[model samples]
Target: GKPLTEVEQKAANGVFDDANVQNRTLSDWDGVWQSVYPLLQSGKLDPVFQKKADADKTKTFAEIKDYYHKGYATDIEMIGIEDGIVEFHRNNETTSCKYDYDGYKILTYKSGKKGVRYLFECKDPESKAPKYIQFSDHIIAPRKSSHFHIFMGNDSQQSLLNEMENWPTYYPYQLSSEEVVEEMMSH
Candidate 1:
């Protein structure tokens, strides 16, 4: 490969002067799962709470951890993504299916903010995949997700749209805890 110019270098490092929203497909999220549950359950993400603690400057580390603990909690043991497939592992069983990109949705939150959620629909009825699934990874372009809040269920897209709680989030397994802490703080 040839060397990149200054502009290309900045873009490569995610330094965008004029970032715009870009539509994405399931393939953009390939290699996205991290099996982050074990670390979350083991308090490995505590540094993320530490960032909040220092930012608010009013809560103990213990209190911060307790306050934000619920968001990262999950029961799904692991998930894998590749091509257009989303594979889930839970309770010693596994389910794998292909998802078709169904476009994105803008959601209004209780905090008076709006965010975009990318949607995907299962292509196989008997594949044991969620009927509807969505992703909110705090980024809105074609970039690979560093972390994401995933909403999935056997419900229809409309019903899944109504769900705003218990979004199981995951990080890339390759990223260290400190990197997770850094990413959380940067966001």
Candidate 2:
């Protein structure tokens, strides 16, 4: 099992210390859904191969869960396989999951309607030690919304760029390396 270094441990703790991060983690799921409901109803996500939410109907937890499970989760696994990401582990409750590929460990936490949070932990290629932490909060906002934080380390630049290049083809929008880095640095 991988372990965190002292500095890494401290930084990880600091992530929760930030008020903004805490707010995001505490953000209302219903409000987030409401904000993006229109785009889902407008067929913006139709090309992604998931069952679309009914445009004329109100959003429900079942519809949201089904769409992610049948659509987003499946597609992410497909992309991971194509890109050499292997399954790590998924908890019995199915609320948490992990994947590993190319010196990166992706830890994902699901919060029902609040959305999924992806912690892309990049490590030293040989040592497998944590070098960077990049956040990809996919649930709280639309795909276009940029929500990332660099909790520790500095070696994730190239890895982040690679993800930015490939993820847009499957998701609704793409994140620029510039935007991601800028946000990370700001924090």
- Scored by lDDT, the top model is 1
- Cα lDDT, model 2, residue 55: 36
TM-score of 2: 0.21
- Model 1 deviation from the true structure expressed as Cα RMSD, one decimal place: 4.9
* Model 1: CA > 4 A from native: 1-20, 57-63
Ten contiguous residues with the weakest lDDT in model 1: 11-20
Once fitted onto the true fold, the runs of candidate 2 whose alpha carbons sit more than 4 angstroms away are 1-19, 23-135, 138-155, 158-187
lDDT (0 to 1) per candidate: 0.72, 0.30
lDDT of 2 by residue, 63-152 (tens): 654453432231121111113121211232111113232222233223212222334443336433334333344322222323322222
Worst 10 residues of 2 by lDDT: 26-35
- For residues 1-187, write the lDDT of model 1, one tens digit per residue: 3344464444434443333446787776778476565776688777777767887866888887765556556677677898778988888898888888888876666765556679998879789877888988655566666677888877687787887656778877678877776777763
